[PDB]
């Protein structure tokens, strides 16, 4: 198991972008 730690870094970074993604649409609907 070598690339399992590198592919988990790509999953954890994009999943944190989804936290700002739902926050992007939740903020756009007020204005």
């Amino acid at each position: 198991r070598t690339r399992l730690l590198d592919s988990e870094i790509k999953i954890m970074k994009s999943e944190v972008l989804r936290v700002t993604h739902e926050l992007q649409a939740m903020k756009d609907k007020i204005k």
Partner: protein, 76 residues
């Protein structure tokens, strides 16, 4: 290590961080120097947007590289 935070006001901010630190800790350090909360802070490295969920190493941010500082600008 030291890094550079360059504003658009011609002002350069230096911070002592570690390469494994998250971006929100760096924004907390910016709040420690300035008092601006991190939701009003935006950081750009070589034209790329920084996300608080990742580290400096994820964007290959190293010793004394130059950031950009743009502020949240909402009106009304």
């Amino acid at each position: 290590m030291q890094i550079f935070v360059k504003t658009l006001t011609g002002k350069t901010i230096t911070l002592e961080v570690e390469p494994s630190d998250t971006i929100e800790n760096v924004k907390a350090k910016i709040q420690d120097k300035e008092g601006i909360p991190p939701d009003q802070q935006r950081l750009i490295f070589a034209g790329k947007q920084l996300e608080d969920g990742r580290t400096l190493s994820d964007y290959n941010i190293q010793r004394e590289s130059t950031l950009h500082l743009v502020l949240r600008l909402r009106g009304g």
